[PDB]
């Protein structure tokens, strides 16, 4: 920050203003922390680590209950559908795995 302070003292406002507005760090931290509780501790490992059909269903149950944190995370609708289709591909992968 002191470097930016020196630049502000030397009035070389190009660097300071570009560093304060062009760095997408602000919206990045916002959107990242926004999706932080949903993308945290996801039990998808249970599907890829399941061997029994019971565990397949149990993994789906736990995953779908974990997926309820949506309102508090603002995840995009269509992108959520994309992740859903990825979930089913993990499902079908484990289906042929147990199969």
């Amino acid at each position: 920050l002191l470097t930016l302070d020196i630049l502000k003292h030397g009035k070389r406002f190009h660097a300071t203003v570009s560093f304060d507005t062009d760095t997408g760090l602000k919206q990045a931290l916002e959107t990242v922390n926004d999706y932080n509780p949903l993308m945290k501790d996801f039990p998808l490992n249970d599907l890829l680590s399941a061997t029994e059909l019971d565990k397949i269903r149990q993994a789906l149950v736990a995953i779908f209950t974990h997926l309820r944190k949506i309102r508090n995370t603002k995840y995009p609708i269509q992108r959520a559908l994309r992740l859903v289709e990825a979930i089913s591909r993990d499902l079908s992968s484990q289906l042929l795995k147990v199969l």
Binding site: F13, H14, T21, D22
Partner: protein
């Protein structure tokens, strides 16, 4: 495509330009077109008909200068096209018009037609990839490293005060008055006619501009100084003549603070600043008084800001801290700020697409005007 964008300040008397990402405008030349008014006989004479650029000042005793932009509004569009092509000429930038995003400035509250026609020029004659037109105030705030303030500038033809609070501009508090540098110079020319010098030619008018920039100075109390005789500066013409100015050296830039002298019911520059503040809200008045940012070449008068403090202090409420910041690069604040805004990615998310302009036209720029 997006190469290094170009910033052009259409100063109504001095156009300032250069690329973005720079730090100073290396292309500063007065705004006019000088055509010769004499007869050509000797082969091997000067070159070309128009004389935009430094060649004008080099051979001003031949030309017949014509100003294209009067009071920020362009009258002779062909001259502005020639000037803009001269900005892209081999002596100024050497780039091609189809290579850079253009950041054109504009005096606030200019007629709609001015923006429209400028769009036509930059997208039909020049085929620029992108174009953005903004206020001159915002740029000065960028160049002065701030976010809140009242940019009170004085270009060569338009003075105005734009109060911007925390990056949010208040449009209904914008005060614009068309009395700047050219009117100060014109009034000084009239005074020299009454002093017996009869400057009436075009080159003589730019000599008057040189006098205004060098010998005038502002008053403190024009009556205290009116009752007493003054220095009576001795300015030397390029010919070698000698001119004396007398009390008009302080009476000439009085037109800014008082347009009654030129016979015009309008407001002073102090009234513009004070009204521009008071047209806004109440919670912001104190902060706007504490942050007054000047710019514009016609604020470089010696002894100007001190009189501005006495004037605004005489008008503003009791004991409010009025704080005027006047940097050294006032002449290029709009350019430097244009370089700052044009050296960003938000600028890419802020200009007007050439395709979108072709699809829409005037409505496009009037939507993205802010």
């Amino acid at each position: 495509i997006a190469n290094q964008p170009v910033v052009i300040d259409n100063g109504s008397g001095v156009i300032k330009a250069g690329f973005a990402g720079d730090q100073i405008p290396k292309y500063c030349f007065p705004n006019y077109v000088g055509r010769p008014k004499h007869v050509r006989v000797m082969a091997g004479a000067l070159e070309g008909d128009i004389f935009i650029g430094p060649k004008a000042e080099e051979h001003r005793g031949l030309l017949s200068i014509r100003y294209p932009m009067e009071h920020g509004i362009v009258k002779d569009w062909n001259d502005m096209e020639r000037i803009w092509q001269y900005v892209y000429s081999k002596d100024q930038l050497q780039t091609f018009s189809e290579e850079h995003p253009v950041l054109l400035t504009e005096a606030p509250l200019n007629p709609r037609k001015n923006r429209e026609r400028a769009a036509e020029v930059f997208f039909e004659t020049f085929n620029v990839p992108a174009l953005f037109i903004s206020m001159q105030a915002v740029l000065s705030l960028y160049a002065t490293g701030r976010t809140t303030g009242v940019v009170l500038d004085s270009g060569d033809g338009v003075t105005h005060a734009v109060p911007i609070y925390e990056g949010f501009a208040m449009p209904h508090s914008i005060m614009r008055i068309d009395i700047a540098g050219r009117d100060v110079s014109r009034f000084l020319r009239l005074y020299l006619r009454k002093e017996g010098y009869d400057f009436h030619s075009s080159s003589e008018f730019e000599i008057v501009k040189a006098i205004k920039e060098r010998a005038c100075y502002l008053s403190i109390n024009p009556q205290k100084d009116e009752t007493l005789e003054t220095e009576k500066a001795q300015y030397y013409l390029p010919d070698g003549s000698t001119i004396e100015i007398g009390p008009s050296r302080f009476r000439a830039p009085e037109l800014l603070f008082r347009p009654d002298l030129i016979g015009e019911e309008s407001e002073g520059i102090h009234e513009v600043l004070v009204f521009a503040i008071q047209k806004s809200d109440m919670d912001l008045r104190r902060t706007l008084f504490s942050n007054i940012v000047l710019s514009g070449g016609s604020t470089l008068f010696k002894g100007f800001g001190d009189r501005l403090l006495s004037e605004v202090k005489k008008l503003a409420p009791k004991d409010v801290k009025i704080r005027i910041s006047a940097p050294q690069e006032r002449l290029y604040s709009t350019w430097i700020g244009g370089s700052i805004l044009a050296s960003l990615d938000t600028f890419k998310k802020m200009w007007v697409s050439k395709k979108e302009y072709e699809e829409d036209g005037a409505r496009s720029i009037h939507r993205k005007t802010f």
